[PDB]
């Protein structure tokens, strides 16, 4: 997260880290046994870490739960970045506490200009690299689909939205992928991609979760 702030311990309790010996993606806990993340974060033998604020130390409030099923969306297209969503069924229920809680799915899609909370442990710099120890947070508005399409010609589908600042300086970044975009208390986005980080006229692009709610509900119901 570039141009953000330290979330604090209890502030983003639905944030999880996707781990295979190292942190590589974010994710969101949507109930005690299911996490949503990005399809491009798919990896064998994922461990989900929950209750973490400082990713680099064993604070004790952590829970490390192995994935039992990692289900990439069946239309995920690695050529076009479309349908960039994955569900992870955890092998056991997370125990919920002050640092571990679920985020609920939206009942409808969010509008342009709505302020959202974007979080992760990704790069905090627009040029060069610096990775934080603690979870970082950013308030960023949804951008209209027209300006998202003007920002990235030929690449924005109906299953993506832009959020952030066309001025630059504030954005998600590498290491934030798969993490939450929460608007009006509901999971509306998943960190996916962009051109650089926090660059002028190159906002973040996020998987549009409101389009997938029926797929998520069905998938959970059948698995």
């Amino acid at each position: 997260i570039v141009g953000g702030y330290t979330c604090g311990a209890n502030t983003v309790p639905y944030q999880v880290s996707l781990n295979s010996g190292y942190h590589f993606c974010g994710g969101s806990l949507i109930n005690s046994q299911w996490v949503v993340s990005a399809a491009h974060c798919y990896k064998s033998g994922i461990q989900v870490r929950l209750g973490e604020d400082n990713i680099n130390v064993v604070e004790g409030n952590e829970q490390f739960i192995s994935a039992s099923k990692s289900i990439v969306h069946p239309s995920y297209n690695s050529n076009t970045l479309n349908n960039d969503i994955m569900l992870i069924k955890l092998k056991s229920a997370a125990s919920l506490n002050s640092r571990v809680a679920s985020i609920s799915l939206p009942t409808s899609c969010a509008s342009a200009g709505t302020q959202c909370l974007i979080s992760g442990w990704g790069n905090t710099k627009s040029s060069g690299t610096s990775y934080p120890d603690v979870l970082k947070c950013l308030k960023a508005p949804i951008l209209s689909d027209s300006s998202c399409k003007s920002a990235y010609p030929g690449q924005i589908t109906s299953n993506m939205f832009c959020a952030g600042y066309l001025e630059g300086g504030k954005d998600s970044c590498q290491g934030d992928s798969g993490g939450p975009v929460v608007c009006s208390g509901k999971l509306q986005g998943i960190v996916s991609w962009g051109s650089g980080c926090a660059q002028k006229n190159k906002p973040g692009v996020y998987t549009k979760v409101c389009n997938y709610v029926s797929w998520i509900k069905q998938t959970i119901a059948s698995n």
Partner: protein, 163 residues
């Protein structure tokens, strides 16, 4: 699908670090630039015996993940991360053919993938994303090995973090 790995067993980073591409069959030769046609400046990417370990590269994906997988479309560049110079592309040019060259623009999604081959990795070029790839190999000319499309005959590299 697999994570691309360096010679120390660590995942290759998305832009953050530079890496030498160390050929397994031409150990005494490193990445450099050379002139192709009637061009004034050297713009062709070559493996040069008088240039070892050679110029290091960065691998870049727009995806907000900090590692590179074999399935990601990549830009490959010399020089710094957030720059648009030293960006590899493939350009038809005599006498080399489909020659790997450097340019000063960078698309959202680059045309390359890094794919496991034998004891290291090959660079594969995609004219378009939906299609099969074309291996990058070597054209021996003027006592250097010009990187060019040579499908079936890839130059196999190990990826050594520059440090």
């Amino acid at each position: 699908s697999s994570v691309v790995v360096d010679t120390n067993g660590q995942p290759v980073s998305n832009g953050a670090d530079a890496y030498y591409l160390v050929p397994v069959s031409h150990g005494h030769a490193g990445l450099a630039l050379a002139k192709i046609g009637n061009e004034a400046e050297p713009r062709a990417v070559v493996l040069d015996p008088h240039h070892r370990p050679g110029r290091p590269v960065r691998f870049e994906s727009p995806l907000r993940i900090n590692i590179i997988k074999e399935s990601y479309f990549l830009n490959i560049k010399f020089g710094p991360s957030s720059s648009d110079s030293g960006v590899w592309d493939v350009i038809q040019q005599d006498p080399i053919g489909l020659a790997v060259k450097v340019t000063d623009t960078k698309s959202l999604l680059g045309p390359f993938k890094v794919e496991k081959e034998g004891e290291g990795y090959k660079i594969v070029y995609y004219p378009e994303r939906g299609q099969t790839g074309l291996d990058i190999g070597l054209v021996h000319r003027n006592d250097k090995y010009y990187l060019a499309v040579k499908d079936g005959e890839p130059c196999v590299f190990k990826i050594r973090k520059a440090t």
